[PDB]
């Protein structure tokens, strides 16, 4: 989740199980559809909702212009 440009916010239990909540930019949120299957053996889930705006680092900034 962090190598997906993630900034964690905390974790909590649920079905025991446990829930984890973070902030991830949409661009790095495509493979994550089926990636939770590759990891959790098909036992995880998610929801994903938009939040806000920010300023991408100049590593991806100055390279998106092409």
């Amino acid at each position: 989740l962090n190598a997906r440009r993630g900034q964690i916010l905390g974790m909590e239990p649920r079905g025991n199980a446990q829930v984890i909540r973070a902030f991830v930019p949409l661009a790095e949120m495509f493979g994550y559809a089926t990636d939770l299957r590759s990891k959790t053996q098909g036992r995880g889930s998610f929801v994903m909702f938009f939040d806000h705006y920010q300023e991408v680092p100049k590593q991806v900034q100055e390279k998106l212009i092409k």
């Binding site: 939770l36 098909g42 036992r43």
Partner: protein
């Protein structure tokens, strides 16, 4: 006949009754993340009814939802009317070669009959086991007699049968124990 081949025959005979249990436990609306619960269902493929395990691919990605991956989009409408079939009370989306089924949190009216269903399939498995064991002792009654075998021998053959029988019982108890905690979870 003989002993080792009677045990292998027994352990084999009891396995089939055990796997039959697992079949009966998946095909229930469990925690409802199960894929095989929807894998067997009466449909309508070209007039004739047939099991959809020769029609589509059930796969359970996330637990809360489930997909019934199909390969015939005129059968998905035959499946969709066959999912909307009296039972599960579920509202599936369809098409785009897709067929999604989200699962509501099991209510205490259905959670009530789920456990009750599990333990029922549980006991019947054990009775399948125990009825096989008695078949095995009768296989032993003749086999000891037929072969002019010792007494203290034919005693341990009984205990060795019990050892075997308490094998398939503990697993059967453990199967329906887990499947419950997924319903209570």
């Amino acid at each position: 006949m003989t002993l080792k081949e009677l045990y292998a025959e027994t352990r084999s005979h009891m396995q089939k009754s055990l796997e039959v249990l697992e079949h009966n436990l998946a095909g229930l609306r469990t925690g409802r993340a199960n894929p095989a619960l929807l894998l067997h269902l009466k449909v309508e493929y070209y007039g004739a009814h047939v099991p959809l395990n020769q029609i589509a691919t059930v796969t359970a990605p996330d637990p809360r939802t489930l997909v019934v991956q199909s390969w015939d989009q005129n059968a998905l409408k035959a499946i969709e009317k066959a999912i909307r079939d009296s039972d599960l009370g579920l509202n599936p989306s369809n098409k785009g070669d897709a067929l999604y089924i989200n699962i509501p949190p099991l209510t205490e009216e259905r959670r009530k009959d789920l456990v009750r269903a599990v333990r029922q399939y549980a006991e019947e498995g054990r009775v399948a086991i125990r009825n096989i064991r008695r078949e095995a002792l009768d296989k032993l009654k003749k086999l000891a007699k037929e072969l002019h075998l010792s007494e203290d021998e034919t005693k341990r053959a009984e205990a060795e049968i019990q050892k075997i029988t308490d094998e398939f019982i503990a697993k059967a108890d453990q199967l329906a124990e887990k499947k419950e905690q997924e319903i209570l979870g």
